[PDB]
Amino acid sequence: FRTFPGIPKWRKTHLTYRIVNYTPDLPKDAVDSAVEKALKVWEEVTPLTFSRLYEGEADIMISFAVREHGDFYPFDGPGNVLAHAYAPGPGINGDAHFDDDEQWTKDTTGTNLFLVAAHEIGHSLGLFHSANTEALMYPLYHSLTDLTRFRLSQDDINGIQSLYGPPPD
Amino acid sequence: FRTFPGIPKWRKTHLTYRIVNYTPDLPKDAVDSAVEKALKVWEEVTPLTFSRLYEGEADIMISFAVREHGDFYPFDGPGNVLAHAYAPGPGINGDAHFDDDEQWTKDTTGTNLFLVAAHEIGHSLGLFHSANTEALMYPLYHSLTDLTRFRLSQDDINGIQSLYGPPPDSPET
Numbered sequence: 019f020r021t022f023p024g025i026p027k028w029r030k031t032h033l034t035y036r037i038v039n040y041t042p043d044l045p046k047d048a049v050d051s052a053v054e055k056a057l058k059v060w061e062e063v064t065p066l067t068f069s070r071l072y073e074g075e076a077d078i079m080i081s082f083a084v085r086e087h088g089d090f091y092p093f094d095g096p097g098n099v100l101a102h103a104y105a106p107g108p109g110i111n112g113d114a115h116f117d118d119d120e121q122w123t124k125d126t127t128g129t130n131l132f133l134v135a136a137h138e139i140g141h142s143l144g145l146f147h148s149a150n151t152e153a154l155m156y157p158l159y160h161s162l163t164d165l166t167r168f169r170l171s172q173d174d175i176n177g178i179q180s181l182y183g184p185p186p187d
Numbered sequence: 188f189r190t191f192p193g194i195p196k197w198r199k200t201h202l203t204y205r206i207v208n209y210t211p212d213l214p215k216d217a218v219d220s221a222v223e224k225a226l227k228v229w230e231e232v233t234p235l236t237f238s239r240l241y242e243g244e245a246d247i248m249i250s251f252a253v254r255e256h257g258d259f260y261p262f263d264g265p266g267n268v269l270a271h272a273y274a275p276g277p278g279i280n281g282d283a284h285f286d287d288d289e290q291w292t293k294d295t296t297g298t299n300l301f302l303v304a305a306h307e308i309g310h311s312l313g314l315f316h317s318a319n320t321e322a323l324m325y326p327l328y329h330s331l332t333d334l335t336r337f338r339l340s341q342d343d344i345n346g347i348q349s350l351y352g353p354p355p356d357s358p359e360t
């Protein structure tokens with residue numbers, strides 16, 4: 019795993035998230051579920067808890083975008099960069115952006131929203147790209163048919179606990 | 188990507204550089220622009236920033252030299268070795284020297300100063316020679332045309348970020 023104990027991690031255990039907009043690719047219920055599931059992968063092995071907001075600035079602002087979208091890193095059309103996120107902090111830090119030029123799907127027939135969102139929130143919590151190839155934090159989208167086999171790698175758990183510790187239970 | 192033995196890296200996130208002398212090959216402003224652009228490629232993907240000094244010792248002392256020049260490794264005349272730089276650290280470390288027996292150029296008609304300067308500053312920041320053929324840090328200068336297309340390869344990016352991490356306000360690229 020790769021962390022950089024200069025860069026601040028979140029100073030609190032309870033984080034807020036807000037889904038700012040929805041992709042035409044999927045039913046709003048699936049976006050909500052994918053995000054919820056992605057957040058749970060991390061709450062499970064740390065003492066981090068999350069709550070949703072519908073107005074104001076949540077710590078982790080989640081949005082779909084295309085090309086230029088208000089930050090210094092424009093998306094690139096179809097494929098390649100699927101989404102990006104910023105490490106802990108105020109403002110844009112902790113935010114996660116998803117490229118709508120990708121076809122977001124609940125299965126593996128396009129870009130699986132859940133898996134990429136899980137990786138993105140990784141970034142939102144202070145995790146950087148892992149060198150380990152089976153890690154969720156590995157920067158490579160494998161059109162991984164077996165979503166039924168997904169499991170956070172020991173590397174991912176080791177990395178996120180390095181910053182926040184284990185769950186209290 | 189490779190690092191120097193022992194992972195030396197700068198501890199400060201902000202470094203100073205000073206251009207000590209100028210080559211007869213190019214006007215001074217073109218030398219300055221090539222160096223600025225060479226520093227900029229790395230600034231863009233790390234938390235590192237740089238500031239120019241015009242007197243005294245900057246972390247990264249940049250100079251043109253020929254044959255013996257006051258250090259352990261004399262240059263070798265036209266061709267072959269083009270420049271050499273030192274790993275992060277005090278004094279001579281972090282410095283970058285360019286062989287003036289090469290024809291330093293703004294384009295590809297001679298040895299592109301920008302390109303070799305970018306590889307040298309790589310060295311000054313802690314990166315060693317990549318075994319990956321398309322990495323700026325591959326130790327071979329080549330028959331490249333499009334300077335316009337220039338972008339650090341992922342291997343160079345993963346190298347320098349393994350050392351410094353990415354820009355604080357930026358995603359990992």
Ligand SMILES: CON[C@H]1C[C@H](C(=O)NO)N(S(=O)(=O)c2ccc(OC)cc2)C1
Nearest residue numbers: 098099100101102134137157158159360
């Ligand atoms: C080294 O840069 N690589 C990158 C930059 C960007 C990324 O990691 N964003 O978080 N891409 S990506 O968008 O293709 C990507 C994003 C999420 C992911 O989840 C499993 C795997 C790959 C891969």
Ligand SMILES: CON[C@H]1C[C@H](C(=O)NO)N(S(=O)(=O)c2ccc(OC)cc2)C1
Nearest residue numbers: 267268269270271302303306326327328
């Ligand atoms: C033993 O290493 N081989 C070497 C030693 C020396 C070097 O790497 N200086 O940094 N050379 S070189 O001078 O030919 C060289 C320098 C810069 C460069 O930038 C794109 C490509 C090649 C190639």
Ligand SMILES: [Ca+2]
Nearest residue numbers: 095097099117
């Ligand atoms: Ca894209």
Ligand SMILES: [Ca+2]
Nearest residue numbers: 077109111112
């Ligand atoms: Ca935020």
Ligand SMILES: [Ca+2]
Nearest residue numbers: 043118120121
């Ligand atoms: Ca879409």
Ligand SMILES: [Ca+2]
Nearest residue numbers: 246278280281
């Ligand atoms: Ca020095």
Ligand SMILES: [Ca+2]
Nearest residue numbers: 264265266268
């Ligand atoms: Ca030479």
Ligand SMILES: [Ca+2]
Nearest residue numbers: 212287288289
């Ligand atoms: Ca010359």
Ligand SMILES: [Zn+2]
Nearest residue numbers: 087089091115
């Ligand atoms: Zn963005």
Ligand SMILES: [Zn+2]
Nearest residue numbers: 137141157359
């Ligand atoms: Zn990523």
Ligand SMILES: [Zn+2]
Nearest residue numbers: 256258260284
């Ligand atoms: Zn020298």
Ligand SMILES: [Zn+2]
Nearest residue numbers: 306310316326
């Ligand atoms: Zn070199």
